[PDB]
Structures are given as structure tokens and as C-alpha cells.
């Protein structure tokens, strides 16, 4: 079905601890495939998935150059932010950026994104129309005027409609055996007596990809969402994910409870 | 600006059984700012050579990281994760439970 590609920038200034640090990660769906850290000895964009290693050298030199220029320009962006808010040069501040594209089953653009945050709060975002900006405050309005006078939205639109989608489709073809294969969850149920009259039933889903999953406990076919404890989906470290759902039930009534899993990889 | 405390999960990569290799993970998520200190502990002592993923963040801008190391669970070995953040006055220790 639908797929996605995203890049995450984090720039962190640190007075007295060296120049600001810059980190970039790239994701196709829930799979990390590229990384960069300005604090590296010889900073370069490095592969993190097998199917991205087939890219020749020129790709890696180009991406590394992009990342070094991004390092410098986001140091300047941190300086500009400190100027806009009349903040002190002794404090640490963070600029974040998410951008990329969502494509549908036909492989063409379905939605674009380019959002920037400062100190954890929204700074400026690119609206759905790929042609206008949403600003968070007055400083963001200064940035928005600078960018709409520079016709930034059109270049963002050109990238998101073009290179984003094409490169994402190439990545999907190169890694079709992992990115387009759905790993169904392996599920089981554990019992834990919490007292003499209650027992905790925990339903486990392990080793599934992608991360989207729905785990519900049912009692006599009735959803127990009000009574279910659900942990946030977590990575296993092998590019798969884990989740569990727990309910406390009266002893001797366990047979009324069944776990229900919804995942793309299950028929 | 903004201060968000980290949520912590400690867990194995595969269902734990004593005697076979596995991976111990500490997943920290939902925190801000980014500076954080994460250690894995075996019977209270810090494990060296623990790896950690690259800094990323969710749709709400809060950061997440995965610290991990190879380990062989036993009946008596106790494992934990110690996390320090600007929002924590003292480090928080979360013990590993094979059932969670």
C-alpha cells in the first residue's frame, strides 16, 4: 500500500562544549537507512540498510556534502534563532526538522512535509497545499516572510514531487524483499497471578514489521479497551517491533478472554 | 525551553531463556532536550560496550533512542537500565522483567 520517506535533522548548540552538533537520520517506512553525525572524526553519510549500499560513490559524496553544508547552515540558523528571541549565547538550544513524502499504492506523491521546530515547539511548517507556510509566532513570521519572498515553497514542491518520490520508489525496488514484505506478529499469552482472586493476562506480539499494529483484549467478544494496559510499540533492534497488552481478570474467568491482533501481515 | 521527561522500557530482543544469547534493550523516548545518559547494569555494575542508535524523534518532536548490548540471561543475573536527564534530579533505574 502506501509508503513514506522521511529525513530528521537535529541541531544542538552547546556553549563552551564546541560548535553546535548536527545529526541527520533517514527512514523509509519504519526502516532506518542513512545517518550522519557532525561529531564524527571524518563526518560522512553512512549506510544503515543493505539495499542502500548499492548506491555508488557519487551518491555518498553528494549526500556527505549536503550534510556538511547543512551543518554550517544550521549553526547559522541557531545563531539567527538566538538573535530573534533576544536569548543569551550561554544557553543550549535545539532546532529540529522533519521533511519528506508519502506516496500511495501507485507510487506517486500523496502528501508532502517540511516542518521545523525550535526548543521542542513548532517553529514553521509547510502547509498541505505545498505552496504556503504556517508560522508559530512573530519570529516565525519573519522567517516566513524571508522564505515566501525567496520562493522557497516552489522549490520544496519541486523536490517533494520529484526527487523524493523517484528515490523512494528506487529504494522500494532495491529493498523489495524487506521493505515490501510484511512480517506478521508472533503472538502468545502469559498468565501471572497478582493475588489469589485476580490474574494478569499479557498478550505478546513480537517480530512484526511495519510497526503499525492493533492489540485488543476481548471478554465474551466485547472490547476491553477501558481495562487494557498497552505499552508503546518498541523496536527489537533487528528492524522488527514488539508490543503487549495486559488485563487483570478474576481468577477462573480467563476462558472468557481472547487476544485480537490486527496487522498488515496477517490475513 | 520545554522539558519533557523520558519514558523508559527495558526488555530483551527475543523471549529470554537461560543459557542462550540475546540482546538487552533500553528504549528511552518522549524526552526533551536531547542530552541524556543511559547505562545498562548487570547486578548493579555498568556494562561497557553498549551501543546506541542515532538520535531521532517522533511526530511530536520528542526524541527517542535505543541502547542495546548482547547478553546471556541466567536464573540469577539481574539486569537494569539507569537513565539520567535534565528533568530527573537523580538517575532512574528500571529493572529488567522477562515478563514485560
Amino acid at each position, epitope marked *: 500500500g502506501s509508503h513514506s520517506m522521511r529525513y530528521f535533522y537535529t541541531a544542538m548548540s552547546r556553549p563552551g562544549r564546541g560548535e553546535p552538533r548536527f545529526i541527520t537520520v533517514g527512514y523509509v517506512d519504519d526502516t532506518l537507512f542513512v545517518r550522519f553525525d557532525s561529531d564524527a572524526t571524518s563526518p560522512r553519510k553512512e549506510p544503515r540498510a543493505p539495499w542502500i549500499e548499492q548506491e555508488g560513490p557519487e551518491y555518498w559524496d553528494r549526500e556527505t556534502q549536503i550534510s556538511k553544508t547543512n551543518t554550517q547552515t544550521y549553526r547559522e540558523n541557531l545563531r539567527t534563532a538566538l538573535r530573534y528571541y533576544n536569548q543569551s549565547e550561554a544557553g543550549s538550544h535545539i532546532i529540529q526538522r522533519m521533511y519528506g513524502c508519502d506516496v500511495g499504492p501507485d507510487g506517486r506523491l500523496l502528501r508532502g512535509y517540511d516542518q521545523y521546530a525550535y526548543d521542542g515547539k513548532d517553529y514553521i511548517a509547510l502547509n498541505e497545499d505545498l505552496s504556503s507556510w504556517t508560522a508559530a509566532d512573530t519570529a516565525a513570521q519573519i522567517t516566513q516572510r524571508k522564505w515566501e519572498a525567496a520562493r522557497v515553497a516552489e522549490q520544496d514542491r519541486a523536490y517533494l514531487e520529484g526527487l523524493c518520490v523517484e528515490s523512494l520508489r528506487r529504494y522500494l525496488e532495491n529493498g523489495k524483499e524487506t521493505l515490501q514484505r510484511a512480517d506478521p506478529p508472533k503472538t502468545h499469552v502469559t498468565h501471572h497471578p497478582i493475588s489469589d482472586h485476580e490474574v494478569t493476562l499479557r498478550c505478546w506480539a513480537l517480530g512484526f514489521y511495519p510497526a503499525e499494529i492493533t492489540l485488543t483484549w476481548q471478554r465474551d467478544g466485547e472490547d476491553q479497551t477501558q481495562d487494557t494496559e498497552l505499552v508503546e510499540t518498541r523496536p527489537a533492534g533487528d528492524r522488527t517491533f514488539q508490543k503487549w497488552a495486559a488485563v487483570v481478570v478474576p481468577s477462573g474467568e480467563e476462558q472468557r478472554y481472547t487476544c485480537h491482533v490486527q496487522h498488515e501481515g496477517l490475513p | 525551553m520545554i*522539558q519533557r521527561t523520558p519514558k523508559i522500557q527495558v526488555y530483551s530482543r527475543h523471549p529470554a531463556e537461560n543459557g542462550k544469547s540475546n540482546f538487552l534493550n533500553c528504549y528511552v*523516548s518522549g524526552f526533551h532536550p536531547s542530552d541524556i545518559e543511559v547505562d545498562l547494569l548487570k547486578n548493579g555494575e555498568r556494562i561497557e560496550k553498549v551501543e546506541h542508535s542515532d538520535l531521532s524523534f517522533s511526530k*511530536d518532536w520528542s526524541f527517542y533512542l535505543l541502547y542495546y548490548t548482547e547478553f546471556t540471561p541466567t536464573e540469577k543475573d539481574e539486569y537494569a537500565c539507569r537513565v539520567n536527564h535534565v528533568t530527573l534530579s537523580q538517575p532512574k533505574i528500571v529493572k529488567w522483567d522477562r515478563d514485560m
Partner: antibody, heavy 120, light 108 residues
Framework: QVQLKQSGPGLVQPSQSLSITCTVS????????LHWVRQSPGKGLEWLGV???????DYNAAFISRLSIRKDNSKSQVFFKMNSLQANDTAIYYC??????????????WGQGTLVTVSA | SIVMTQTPKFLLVSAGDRVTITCKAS??????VTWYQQKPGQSPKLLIY???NRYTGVPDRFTGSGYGTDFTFTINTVQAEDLAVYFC?????????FGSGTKLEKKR
């Protein structure tokens, strides 16, 4: 248009639990966090907790021993549950949402409120 | 836990004069301060956020200012519809504490 509609009993016995359902329209719980605040004469406005888009939660430390916030994304419902209620807890309870998907804890959007009285 | 101290508990006002409400944080709180207005029987209504940014549809009379610890909420020309309770709230750190509130009442 963002809409938070609350439902729940307004009278609970002074030891039992309080359950409030906030039903959401105009946005998806998979994208926004939902917070719970209360207002009482003794303590004024109190932020109680939040459930984020991914299902993780944050609780007011003074309430963490008896508070739970759960949700059903597909049904757009958030379930606030608080245990061991006393006379302190009689108050108006609100669900609330921030402006954006960030972790901001200020609210342009409030539920209509649920007055709960704790009495036997 | 950061404590927000809302200076005036009540203000006797006549239509036409400036009101100034103060909110002091126990610890530094950056610009993460919000101002609400509440009328009897209703939920709080957002007025100011990020210390000085006006929410959509909030009239020009209302104004927020401040950074760090001392914050100020001003109504430049009070109108009869402004008789209500006003609250500050910090967003810096949990539990995102609210001020005690300032009740505006009619002077006689």
C-alpha cells in the same frame, strides 16, 4: 472542527473509582496528545495527565499511584480513570487538547466538563 | 515543581481603565507561559500563549509580555464583557502548574 465530548457519572462513592470517557472529533488520536485537567475550589486548576499519540503516558506525580489514561484510537475515545476518591477529589474534570501535534501543555480546546461529587 | 504566583487575587475595575495582572514563576520558565479567561459555567478560554502571542480571535485589548520569571497580562481598555477570572499557566515542566487566578469585579 475540534470537538471533545465528555461522558461519565457525576456521583461516586468515597472510596470507589471515577471513569470519564472523552470522545474526540475533528482529529485523530494517532496524531495528537490528549490531556486531562481538573478544577476544584481547594486546589484550583490542576493538570492531571496526558496520553500521547503513540500510547505513552505522563501523569502528575501527586496522582501517579491512582491514575490511568487509556484510549481506543479507532473509536476516537480516551478513558480517564482515577481510584480511591476522597472529598478532595470533588471537582470539574476536563479533557483538553493543544493547538499542534507538539508536546505543548496549553489548551485552546476543552471538553464541556464533568462535575463529579464524591459522597456516600 | 514550578509554582506560578498570580499577583492580584481580585481587581475592582470600572469600564475604561487598564488592568495589569502579574505572574511570577518559582524557577525560570523561559517563554512558556499561557493566559486563559474563564466565565462562570464554562471552561477556560485560551487568550495568550508563548508569553506574548495572541490566540486567533482574541481582541487587541489583551496583551501578554515577559520572559523567564516575571510575566504580565494587560487589558488596555476594560469592557463589561471582560469581567471574568484570568489564569496563567506554565508549560516548561510537569505538572504545568496554573496560577491561582485573578477575578475581575465591578467597582462601586
Amino acid at each position: 472542527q475540534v470537538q471533545l465530548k465528555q461522558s461519565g457519572p457525576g456521583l461516586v462513592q468515597p472510596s470507589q473509582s471515577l471513569s470519564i470517557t472523552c470522545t474526540v472529533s475533528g482529529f485523530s488520536l494517532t496524531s495528537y496528545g490528549l490531556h486531562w485537567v481538573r478544577q476544584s475550589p481547594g486546589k484550583g486548576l490542576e493538570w492531571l495527565g496526558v496520553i500521547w499519540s503513540g500510547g505513552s503516558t505522563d501523569y502528575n506525580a501527586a496522582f501517579i499511584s491512582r491514575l490511568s489514561i487509556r484510549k481506543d484510537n479507532s473509536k476516537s475515545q480516551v478513558f480517564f480513570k482515577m481510584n480511591s476518591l476522597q472529598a478532595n477529589d470533588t471537582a470539574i474534570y476536563y479533557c483538553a487538547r493543544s493547538l499542534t501535534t507538539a508536546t505543548s501543555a496549553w489548551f485552546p480546546y476543552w471538553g464541556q466538563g464533568t462535575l463529579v461529587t464524591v459522597s456516600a | 515543581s514550578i509554582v506560578m504566583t498570580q499577583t492580584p487575587k481580585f481587581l475592582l475595575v470600572s469600564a475604561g481603565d487598564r488592568v495589569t495582572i502579574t505572574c511570577k514563576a518559582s524557577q525560570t520558565v523561559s517563554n512558556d507561559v499561557t493566559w486563559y479567561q474563564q466565565k462562570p459555567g464554562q471552561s477556560p478560554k485560551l487568550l495568550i500563549y508563548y508569553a506574548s502571542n495572541r490566540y486567533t480571535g482574541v481582541p487587541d485589548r489583551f496583551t501578554g509580555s515577559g520572559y523567564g520569571t516575571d510575566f504580565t497580562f494587560t487589558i488596555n481598555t476594560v469592557q463589561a464583557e471582560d469581567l471574568a477570572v484570568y489564569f496563567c499557566q506554565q508549560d516548561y515542566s510537569s505538572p504545568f502548574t496554573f496560577g491561582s487566578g485573578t477575578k475581575l469585579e465591578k467597582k462601586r
